[PDB]
Design a binder for these strands. Sequence first.
RNA 1: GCGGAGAAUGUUAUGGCCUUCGGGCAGAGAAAACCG
Lengths: 176, 183
Amino acid sequence: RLDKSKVINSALELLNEVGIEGLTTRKLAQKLGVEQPTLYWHVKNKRALLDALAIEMLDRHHTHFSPLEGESWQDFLRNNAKSFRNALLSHRDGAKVHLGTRPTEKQYETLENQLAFLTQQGFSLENALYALSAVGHFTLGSVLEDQEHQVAKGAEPAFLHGLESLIRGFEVQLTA
Amino acid sequence: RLDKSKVINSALELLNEVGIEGLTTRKLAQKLGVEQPTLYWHVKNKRALLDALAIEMLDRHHTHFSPLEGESWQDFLRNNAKSFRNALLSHRDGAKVHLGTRPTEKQYETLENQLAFLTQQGFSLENALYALSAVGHFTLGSVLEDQEHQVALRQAIELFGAEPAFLHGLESLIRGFEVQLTA
RNA sequence: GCGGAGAAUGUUAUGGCCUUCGGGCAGAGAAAACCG
């Protein structure tokens, strides 16, 4: 009856219906037509479920985490953020559920590959980490306030122009 | 005895001791030695308290929201973010409590003055607004990731305060703002 | 004392509850309550 694919897939849908704060493991159990002591074998508590949702939104939509070979470091940073953005825009309050999740080991591994690639293109290791953190921080902050300001009742162009302010600022600083 | 100056100071202290998630109007009443029906007369619920706490953290520490006499538009944006950052670092989870608070009428009015300042300095109004949202978003995002990841390549993690990423990152937008406006 | 029990209702506390009337209790893996 219940597999890993089924329970989070409905959890992804109920996250849209209710929101992160209103979300409860009990409403999920009732959504699946099951008792809670049974569902505990899949999700131990609410917090673990949020981790599973965060991992699953990144796996599905953050598809440009790696540079398509034959791509500039600029275009990589661009589309990495655009894919990272679209992943947090995939579901309601997507930035919050992604927020507060300890990262996995492959995410570290992907960071070394991200770090190595920029060093290959002339970056210093110091500036490589600063650069990667800056684009990520601005993308995360942009998505958070976007989804939060969307709780009150365009912002996409503000993200684009802001991202290019980082990139073409990265360009000039690399001139060394 | 109880004035809403004291309740904000103690709520800020309870905000530091307990955190945004644990912070509740009930614990604040216990901290002040009063019943909840008494405290309701000052702050109705948690959400009103969050706005009250957020506003005064900016009032205390966001002291460089205005361009200093005889200062570059560049240095303004740097010191604008640095003050906004220090305001969000003033208390525990300061970025989270600041998040989700819709702004005052004075803040809009302050932003229009900010917009005019950079527009007057050669910015287009469209690009003027983009710059301020970007620096704010990155500063907000930078502080959130910082505050979240403190309740916890080989050379890389070794070289990690979090301020240098903010400082170096902010200069990446301004040095990008400079080139982009030279057009 | 602790077993049914990761019990139920409920969320973000102007209220809901215990009290030996001094006071005490708790938030999505609640305070309570019942039942050996």
